[PDB]
Enzyme design. Sequence first.
Site, PDB file in Angstrom:
ATOM      1  N   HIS A   1       1.018  -1.061   0.117  1.00 18.59           N
ATOM      2  CA  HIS A   1       0.057   0.058   0.059  1.00 18.59           C
ATOM      3  C   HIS A   1       0.987   1.046   0.186  1.00 18.59           C
ATOM      4  CE1 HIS A   1       0.496  -0.467   4.767  1.00 18.59           C
ATOM      5  NE2 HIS A   1       0.524   1.206   4.193  1.00 18.59           N
TER       6      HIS A   1
ATOM      7  N   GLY B   1       3.012   5.478   9.447  1.00 20.08           N
ATOM      8  CA  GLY B   1       4.539   5.493   8.985  1.00 20.08           C
ATOM      9  C   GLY B   1       5.205   4.451   9.877  1.00 20.08           C
TER      10      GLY B   1
ATOM     11  N   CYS C   1       4.575   1.767   9.304  1.00 13.56           N
ATOM     12  CA  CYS C   1       4.632   0.003   8.186  1.00 13.56           C
ATOM     13  C   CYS C   1       5.746  -0.313   7.659  1.00 13.56           C
ATOM     14  CB  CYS C   1       3.343   0.458   8.063  1.00 13.56           C
ATOM     15  SG  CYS C   1       1.850   0.241   8.284  1.00 13.56           S
TER      16      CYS C   1
END
Lengths: 303, 303
Positions: B41, B143, B145
Amino acid sequence: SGFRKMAFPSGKVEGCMVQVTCGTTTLNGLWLDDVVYCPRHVICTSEDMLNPNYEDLLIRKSNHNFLVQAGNVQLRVIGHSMQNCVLKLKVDTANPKTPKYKFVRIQPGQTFSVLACYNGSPSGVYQCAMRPNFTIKGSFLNGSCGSVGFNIDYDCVSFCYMHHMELPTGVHAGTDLEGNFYGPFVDRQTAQAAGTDTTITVNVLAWLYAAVINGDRWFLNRFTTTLNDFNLVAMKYNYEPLTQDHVDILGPLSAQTGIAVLDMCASLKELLQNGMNGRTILGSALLEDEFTPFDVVRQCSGV
Amino acid sequence: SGFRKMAFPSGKVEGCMVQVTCGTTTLNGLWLDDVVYCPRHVICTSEDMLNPNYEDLLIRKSNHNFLVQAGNVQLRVIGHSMQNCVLKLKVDTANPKTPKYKFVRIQPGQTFSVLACYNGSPSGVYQCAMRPNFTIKGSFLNGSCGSVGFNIDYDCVSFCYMHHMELPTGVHAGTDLEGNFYGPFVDRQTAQAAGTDTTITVNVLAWLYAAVINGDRWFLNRFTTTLNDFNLVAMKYNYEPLTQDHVDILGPLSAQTGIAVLDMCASLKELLQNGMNGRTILGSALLEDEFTPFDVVRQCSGV
Ligand SMILES: [Cl-]
């Protein structure tokens, strides 16, 4: 989202960890530049630790008696000396992985990361607080002595703790990197007891703010209090007295949540007198006091 | 002495952490050999995540759109592809700090260390369990991820988790390093809920053994039970059914303490029905289920 007890990345410290052996006694040393720091009781036999005369014991030791191993590579000892309760072994090679570092004596109520080691090999990392009675609640077995505690700001490692000993209550004691013990403890195998384990009040409030930030707010009430009023309640439960400096330190957390510090104090006062009623805060069923206000801001902002 | 939630030393993983940016979206990537792994993503805008067509979105991306930064040094992207929910960015340089590693899909009830990162920079380390409902309870902000979970045996790093998303209950979900989510979760911003959060029964017993090893034994009684009897009590409190394989796995802890597993089960049965009565076990006021039997043996033996 979420709030966890989280240690610093240990990579910079792993590269400083060595093994130090004196006779049959083996523990960990900290290798920075051309000096290896380790607890001085490495020179003790099992019978020596009852009442050791470290001065007299160190006199019959020479450089070649200190076996220092960095991984599988042996280091050459060219000097040794005692500074308080640590030994400093000078080696002929500077640690190429030496990070930028400092030695700091941490204040009670502050936290740091511990890199637990055995035979010079890192085993794991976890957070500890330097409790008001100058003990820590860690996880240390035999051979873990010389493991260090540290903080990291940007890229500088601040070493503040090195493990020396364990107390009958199951808590742990050690020194700063200058060899001075935290608290009244001495490195001999004698009857020693930690004093009253008072609670770090400012840290509990910081952790209550962390809960509010993370969506837990069942414990908030419609009440407020004063510093003198709350401290009357903090005394019975062996909490530290709250000061205006503590209130100012909680400024960032009070501003982000919009909950005045004295309002949060009224919530803590009710939690101390009425308990939690089987409920939880941040996944805990008791009041956590090992998160500093800086720990909360750091984790809730992602530094 | 002492028992603590303790993560693995993170040094080997810190050296694999990079930053990946696509447009205005920045997260973390895992750099091993000449491939950088990151959540897919990263290619989504804020409006894309409502119902993203990752196939169609990845088609209008080229190698030069993926900004990969290792510290202050930019890496050259020479290829890209999607494997399930992760992207694999081929770079022209193999990570010189690549440790010996494997990709493993961890089983529910097992634990691993998380290295929380932001903008490719490690922030901290903590332990998580892969819960039976395939969520974890960590500490992840925006942030974070692409932060990974891992285990270490000797010197091989077993990567098992990469962070993707957070659920309304405040829990966290992600994939293995092949891009397959743990649980039924999908990487879109839709209404998603974690199922019943059942308790890892074998882990609670391991933690009770850890308490007995560490001197806590107030909860031991004169009783015993059977597997079928205890499981009748485990059902009401949403505990996992205990099996003979769980009993055998607890063998090392039962042998070291001399407390038969079914005797320990009788203690847990009483703790579930009567509560703790305001007392604590290993410094906790509820029953801990995120320590595997291996975690207990490892910490109580110093591996
Ligand atoms: Cl608790």
